[PDB]
Design an enzyme around this catalytic site. Sequence first.
Site, mmCIF file in Angstrom:
data_model
loop_
_atom_site.group_PDB
_atom_site.id
_atom_site.type_symbol
_atom_site.label_atom_id
_atom_site.label_comp_id
_atom_site.label_asym_id
_atom_site.label_seq_id
_atom_site.Cartn_x
_atom_site.Cartn_y
_atom_site.Cartn_z
ATOM 1 N N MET A 1 1.989 -6.156 -7.893
ATOM 2 C CA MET A 1 0.754 -5.494 -7.522
ATOM 3 C C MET A 1 0.993 -4.429 -6.468
ATOM 4 S SD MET A 1 -1.646 -5.391 -4.886
ATOM 5 C CE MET A 1 -2.133 -6.860 -4.001
ATOM 6 N N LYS B 1 -15.396 -7.752 0.072
ATOM 7 C CA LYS B 1 -15.374 -8.195 1.460
ATOM 8 C C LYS B 1 -16.766 -7.845 1.963
ATOM 9 C CE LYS B 1 -12.823 -8.158 5.780
ATOM 10 N NZ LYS B 1 -11.734 -7.572 6.620
ATOM 11 N N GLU C 1 -11.316 -5.787 -4.844
ATOM 12 C CA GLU C 1 -11.336 -6.834 -3.839
ATOM 13 C C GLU C 1 -12.613 -6.721 -3.000
ATOM 14 O OE1 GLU C 1 -7.780 -7.202 -1.660
ATOM 15 O OE2 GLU C 1 -8.645 -8.547 -0.160
ATOM 16 N N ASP D 1 -2.359 -12.889 1.617
ATOM 17 C CA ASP D 1 -2.784 -11.747 2.398
ATOM 18 C C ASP D 1 -3.189 -12.386 3.710
ATOM 19 O OD1 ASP D 1 -3.672 -9.456 3.527
ATOM 20 O OD2 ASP D 1 -5.199 -8.968 2.030
ATOM 21 N N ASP E 1 -7.617 -14.190 8.571
ATOM 22 C CA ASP E 1 -6.406 -14.089 7.761
ATOM 23 C C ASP E 1 -5.321 -15.053 8.237
ATOM 24 O OD1 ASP E 1 -7.789 -12.118 6.408
ATOM 25 O OD2 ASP E 1 -6.338 -10.515 6.816
ATOM 26 N N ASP F 1 -6.070 -13.384 -3.556
ATOM 27 C CA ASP F 1 -5.533 -13.287 -2.193
ATOM 28 C C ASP F 1 -5.790 -14.606 -1.480
ATOM 29 O OD1 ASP F 1 -4.662 -10.687 -2.589
ATOM 30 O OD2 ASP F 1 -5.816 -9.792 -0.983
ATOM 31 N N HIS G 1 0.923 -1.135 0.000
ATOM 32 C CA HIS G 1 0.000 0.000 0.000
ATOM 33 C C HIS G 1 0.965 1.187 0.000
ATOM 34 C CE1 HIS G 1 -2.344 -2.974 2.270
ATOM 35 N NE2 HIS G 1 -3.426 -2.352 1.843
ATOM 36 N N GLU H 1 -10.617 -12.985 -2.124
ATOM 37 C CA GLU H 1 -9.818 -13.488 -1.012
ATOM 38 C C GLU H 1 -10.566 -14.638 -0.372
ATOM 39 O OE1 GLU H 1 -7.631 -10.831 1.546
ATOM 40 O OE2 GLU H 1 -8.559 -11.750 3.304
ATOM 41 N N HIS I 1 -12.689 -13.862 2.830
ATOM 42 C CA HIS I 1 -13.788 -12.912 2.610
ATOM 43 C C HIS I 1 -15.074 -13.578 2.128
ATOM 44 C CE1 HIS I 1 -10.872 -9.226 2.210
ATOM 45 N NE2 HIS I 1 -10.739 -9.885 3.347
ATOM 46 N N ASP J 1 2.574 1.806 3.331
ATOM 47 C CA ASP J 1 3.439 0.805 3.932
ATOM 48 C C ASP J 1 4.886 1.155 3.614
ATOM 49 O OD1 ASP J 1 1.294 -0.928 4.750
ATOM 50 O OD2 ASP J 1 1.308 -1.873 2.772
ATOM 51 N N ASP K 1 -12.615 -11.540 10.277
ATOM 52 C CA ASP K 1 -11.638 -11.872 9.249
ATOM 53 C C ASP K 1 -10.362 -12.319 9.972
ATOM 54 O OD1 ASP K 1 -10.633 -11.821 6.516
ATOM 55 O OD2 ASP K 1 -9.682 -9.896 6.955
HETATM 56 O O1 LIG Z 1 -9.379 -7.509 4.730
HETATM 57 C C1 LIG Z 1 -8.966 -6.701 3.920
HETATM 58 C C2 LIG Z 1 -8.167 -6.939 2.656
HETATM 59 O O2 LIG Z 1 -7.997 -8.302 2.507
HETATM 60 C C3 LIG Z 1 -6.850 -6.136 2.499
HETATM 61 O O3 LIG Z 1 -5.605 -6.773 2.884
HETATM 62 C C4 LIG Z 1 -6.725 -5.665 1.026
HETATM 63 O O4 LIG Z 1 -6.379 -6.821 0.326
HETATM 64 C C5 LIG Z 1 -5.560 -4.758 0.727
HETATM 65 O O5 LIG Z 1 -5.751 -3.507 1.341
HETATM 66 C C6 LIG Z 1 -5.304 -4.603 -0.780
HETATM 67 O O6 LIG Z 1 -3.978 -5.005 -1.151
HETATM 68 NI NI NI Z 2 -6.920 -9.087 0.808
HETATM 69 NI NI NI Z 3 -9.182 -10.875 5.193
HETATM 70 NI NI NI Z 4 -8.820 -9.561 3.891
#
Ligand SMILES: O=C[C@H](O)[C@@H](O)[C@H](O)[C@H](O)CO
Ligand code: NI
Ligand code: NI
Ligand code: NI
Lengths: 388, 388, 388, 388
Positions: free
Chosen positions: B88, B183, B181, B287, B257, B245, B54, B217, B220, B57, B255
């Site tokens: 990416m 969610k 993406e 991710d 992860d 992801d 990001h 993802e 998600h 980051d 979530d």
């Molecule tokens: O839960 C949130 C997402 O998974 C997050 O990690 C997005 O993927 C990211 O901001 C894009 O790269």
């Molecule tokens: Ni993600």
């Molecule tokens: Ni997630």
């Molecule tokens: Ni996520």
Amino acid sequence: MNYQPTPEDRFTFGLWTVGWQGRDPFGDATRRALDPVESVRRLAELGAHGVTFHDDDLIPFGSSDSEREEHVKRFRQALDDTGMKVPMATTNLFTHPVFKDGGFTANDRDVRRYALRKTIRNIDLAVELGAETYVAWGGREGAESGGAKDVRDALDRMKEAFDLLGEYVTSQGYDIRFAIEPKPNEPRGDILLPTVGHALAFIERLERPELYGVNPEVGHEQMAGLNFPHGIAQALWAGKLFHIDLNGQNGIKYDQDLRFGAGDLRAAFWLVDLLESAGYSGPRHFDFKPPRTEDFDGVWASAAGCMRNYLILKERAAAFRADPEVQEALRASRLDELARPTAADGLQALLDDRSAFEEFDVDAAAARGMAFERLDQLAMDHLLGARG
Amino acid sequence: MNYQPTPEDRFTFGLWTVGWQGRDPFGDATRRALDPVESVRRLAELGAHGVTFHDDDLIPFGSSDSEREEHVKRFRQALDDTGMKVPMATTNLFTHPVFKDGGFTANDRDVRRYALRKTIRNIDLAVELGAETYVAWGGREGAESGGAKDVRDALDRMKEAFDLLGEYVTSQGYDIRFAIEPKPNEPRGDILLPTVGHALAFIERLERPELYGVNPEVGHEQMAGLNFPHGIAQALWAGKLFHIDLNGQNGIKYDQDLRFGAGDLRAAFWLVDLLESAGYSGPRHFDFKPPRTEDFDGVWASAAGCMRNYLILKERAAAFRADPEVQEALRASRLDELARPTAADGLQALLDDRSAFEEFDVDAAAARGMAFERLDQLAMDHLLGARG
Amino acid sequence: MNYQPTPEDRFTFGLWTVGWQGRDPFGDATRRALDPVESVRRLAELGAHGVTFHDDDLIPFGSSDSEREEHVKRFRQALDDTGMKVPMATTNLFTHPVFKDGGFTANDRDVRRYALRKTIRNIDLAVELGAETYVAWGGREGAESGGAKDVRDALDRMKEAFDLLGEYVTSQGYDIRFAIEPKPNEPRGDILLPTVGHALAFIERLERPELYGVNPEVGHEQMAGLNFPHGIAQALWAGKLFHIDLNGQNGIKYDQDLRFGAGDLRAAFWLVDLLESAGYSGPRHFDFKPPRTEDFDGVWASAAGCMRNYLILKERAAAFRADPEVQEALRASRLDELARPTAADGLQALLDDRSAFEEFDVDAAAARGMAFERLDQLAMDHLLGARG
Amino acid sequence: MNYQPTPEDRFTFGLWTVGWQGRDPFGDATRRALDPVESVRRLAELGAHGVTFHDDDLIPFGSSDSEREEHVKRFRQALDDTGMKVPMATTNLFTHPVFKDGGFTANDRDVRRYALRKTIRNIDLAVELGAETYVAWGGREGAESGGAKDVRDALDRMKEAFDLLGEYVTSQGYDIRFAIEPKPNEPRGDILLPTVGHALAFIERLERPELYGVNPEVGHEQMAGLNFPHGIAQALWAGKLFHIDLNGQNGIKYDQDLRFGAGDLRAAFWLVDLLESAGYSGPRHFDFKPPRTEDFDGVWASAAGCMRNYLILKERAAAFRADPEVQEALRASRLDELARPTAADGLQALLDDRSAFEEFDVDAAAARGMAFERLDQLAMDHLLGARG
Ligand SMILES: O=C[C@H](O)[C@@H](O)[C@H](O)[C@H](O)CO
Ligand code: NI
Ligand code: NI
Ligand code: NI
Ligand SMILES: O=C[C@H](O)[C@@H](O)[C@H](O)[C@H](O)CO
Ligand SMILES: O=C[C@H](O)[C@@H](O)[C@H](O)[C@H](O)CO
Ligand SMILES: O=C[C@H](O)[C@@H](O)[C@H](O)[C@H](O)CO
Ligand code: NI
Ligand code: NI
Ligand code: NI
Ligand code: NI
Ligand code: NI
Ligand code: NI
Ligand code: NI
Ligand code: NI
Ligand code: NI
């Protein structure tokens, strides 16, 4: 004061709703079958506008051409005597064991051909009765295990089927449109086109997208923990809300199909608010099951409650929007700004706009409260009729 | 025998993954921050192909143009020294308090303009670094209450934003594509474009649909109780799987992860099977968040487990498909028929085909078992390496 | 007409509720910290009865004995000036990184000993302030993976900890009781004693069960898709409802902690109905988080809405029960028979009773409708204030 | 090499499992009924140990005393010829319409008396056949709406019923114990005693708690998103795991009852690991439904897969525990310390222990990683048979 429905309210019920005999996975029927003609008369007395049906609800499966003709004639007279309409019809591609692996996406090709012929036969009947929408709920389309169904091939078969029906409608010159009803699971472990979103995306891949819309159901989206009013907003945004199934659901579990108003009450309020402000003009169809604990008096009370609840919420939502205090709160929360284009000035202008980045005071903006809680409590007061 | 990853496997990790300090809603960080340069070197040692980021980051928020330049130079040398790529990049439109009501769909117009400028600035950097995909996760786009967000207007703002970025990319002549993406919820009560389906449908309404895809993802879709491999099949069917992801999730809850392989293991197997047989050539991006119970040694072991698990499943899925006994079982279950058109003979022919209805023996067809259980047990044996 | 709360209503708020700065997994704080003294004055103005606290909310972690003394004195004067009470207190065994694997059930023994000492220190303070209940929420007690925690040993450690606190209380001669707060997950993948049921069962295994009760939270049971009012009925049935946490939750997802009334509204109605008819005399404690979109004016409006909603529902539930039409409907549904013993005549008599089997007409009984739908619509009308 | 079950493995199946005709809420039966005698012979061939039954599975409802006698004799000879045992029996208090509002907690008192007599009649038969456990699944005990069932009164009726059965057993001198099977919902909107925890708590309120245990089912706890192995650990901790129902479930949705091993595979692994290390000696009972897509060959393959999967997991779990590398990892994660008392030194000693608070270095403790990820990957490798 009171909340009496009239056919003008466009309330409709499937024959299979008030007619549900109460058979569930762990139990036998608790009610005798209803004659579709009795259901038409009873619903008419309650203020309903019309009824809907699956081919197999009206004409018993395997009926000859003669019996078939008589069943329709009987049903037709009931409609003539009551003034009830039939705005929607659908096919039963889920009850008979032959559809155990699906209809349009069954692995067996002969089964897939049979499912199409069965649907076509009922489309002709639907048009004959005056139905403007033809719903398709692929309840058996899906799987319990991963290797049983290649989803890409299944989607090819699903598209092939819908394109063929579209070619048929356009060739007969029918003025009927299709509406796909999504459901995430039950009776299959996972059902294809599980939500309104997946259905909308799929439709954009059909040969004649204009003929297809969506028929979302309150409980179905809630079985995936999704926000129903949000899904409906997106379907309206896309111009695809051709019809709607109203009922209630208590969260993520089996499909309950409670009467409308029951389940997530606040969601019901926001739904009515949206449909009314958006000018939805299609039927307000109830796809519910009067619980098996009830006798016939309980089923008619349940059906009446469906309409009553819709009418009460419509009143409260109307009062909410027309409240000047609420209109002020909406401006306080910047709903008016959300409706304004972000950059009607165009791309280049935005890039040269120092007020949009270089000179943007992020801390000042961040400090502004959205005032969403005050707004939501005003909505709560209105719903509960607690506005002093 | 063993399962060593090599950059050829295309495994990528976000800087924010191994770099997650462990801060959660109820707790403080349990790990110090990682220097992005150390993360690049460490991941390279583990066999990874590249990293993603990001804007915030890599370049601390509020950094001057000079500091910004130094941070990028430092990062650039680490990449040159390791051979790591950056396929990416994305924008952080969720951490800073200014984005509390969203970025592209914030009710405040000035906030919406700021979000666009911030994204554009990072797109230029992404192209500079060689990224082929630009991901957009609208984490703050949504609401906790019904009246706070008019979804139709919000979708107008979302489309306006994406169209503008598309106009920008095409004007700079960049060879970069976008991936949305989805969610369903968290951090907002309900997030807009909650699933892969809703995202795919929305994309068909953009001015230049060709530039937009989806970045699903694992966890998600599972937060909505949906079948991830099925959703991926639909995205592939639409030609929209631009990136992916990978992680793990234990059902419907927050979530998690978890590292890939953890969570729903069987779903992970079916996913790898699908990606490999479909010829997905994009990155295998993780991710995930190494749990806060771990120290740095535990984070690197967690990251290694991500790749290891993918490699083991790929082996088992390959063995499954190549097994002649499985190929026979697939024919027994009619997967070969599912791949054959239902009616290549056309509509008229189908209507005249008495074998498709009039002379169709429904009881004979219904009696045929699908043999799905035998097939699934073969898949289980293969996954567990229990094939004698 | 209106719904003004007064300290007589026994409404309480944790300092950490209105004081929540807005930090979430994906975002920074959107509000400055509140001085506990300001919170006491503000809540008092709103009609609240008292406040509750974690040791770390009142006395900053790591505070010396002197600073500690000053913080308490300051807090004490605010209470004296407002007349606010402190009926409940608790320990923070979840924020500091040392509790990453738990407090009472941490694998590290030294950590477990530290957690006990920290709790004991705060129990002395709680008694000093007049608190009658001491809540224990084992937020970090649990796991993300299967081999990390041997649950049987963990339950031995949990019992050991609670027994020790019980021995302490009884030795100091304190008049304070414990209440265990269950939660199914978040922040751990799975938390020990996940629901009210598991907590009640565990309590029966303590050395002095009389000292322990349960502190259920609306949203927590709803995160497991359970019926909160039913769980509360069981806790009352067991004589273990020592305290209660009120808030709102929109189904199965992350712990939202919305203000009371929000979330499942019908469940809120049935809860108030139960607490009031059962004569619950403990505090009506709100454990909620004013959404981060809000500024301070929004937090106080959110807190006021908590109490307002409770008062409105109490009115509607009272009206429901006192309605003669509802009392008649209750008899129609045989609620009066449910309250009568099934066999006060005893076992032998039942076995000899031919009317209970041999001569029981099962078809006649089966034909009786329960009239539950009519009853539920009466409840809906009352909730919405739509009774003509 | 291979995984052949033998009666020594104690695998049992309910007659209603392999006998499930495939009737679901949206479909008719896809299989003819099985003669219980054929099921006994078939299961015996597959290596099963015994079978279980509901009264109504063995003796058709409404059967005369003579027909009843013949059905039992027939069943008895099949058992004698195969060597199959009957370790558990239960009552059907859910199928017949008379139980639409429950059996033990029906609002109608006469229905409640009938349910007791029906259960007692079958207890005598169960003892006659040698069953050591009598299961009670209150599938109809619950409600769809709030006012239909006063839960406190319902719990009084539930306790009254169980106490009466306990008085009966003790008076006949039977050596049979009861096991309550919890389920959160389906077929009722919410079922009483929804989880293992609620059932355990309730049992502590019976007059003779010693006679009652719990019969948890994999899928049921998973329908509430709970960790099954954790729930089983708590039941073992309480000394109440009298029996167990094994199957598979894909998350929170309708009760799927897939064959064991399917659904959450990792959970299945941790379950077998726990049952085996804990020395569970009761039957390994499968309460599953072979999917309706299958013919009879598919049902027997499904039943065989149940046992096969249990045997494979048992092998992998045994290999996991016996691995010295895993034993070392367990010590690294302090599982050995979790098993040590926190304060065997006693309360006073703990209060005087400066190393437990005053001189406790919290930062040093917090810095220690738990090494849980390395441990979990070792468990994953073992499950997948990927240990080099
Ligand atoms: O839960 C949130 C997402 O998974 C997050 O990690 C997005 O993927 C990211 O901001 C894009 O790269
Ligand atoms: Ni993600
Ligand atoms: Ni997630
Ligand atoms: Ni996520
Ligand atoms: O749960 C299933 C559906 O809701 C079902 O009722 C369909 O709507 C119907 O077959 C189409 O009319
Ligand atoms: O989600 C967590 C809990 O609800 C938390 O607020 C506890 O109640 C508190 O620590 C005890 O007072
Ligand atoms: O879903 C319901 C139960 O699992 C059911 O099969 C019970 O176990 C049975 O009636 C007792 O043997
Ligand atoms: Ni439905
Ligand atoms: Ni439904
Ligand atoms: Ni429907
Ligand atoms: Ni909470
Ligand atoms: Ni909470
Ligand atoms: Ni709480
Ligand atoms: Ni079950
Ligand atoms: Ni089940
Ligand atoms: Ni069972």
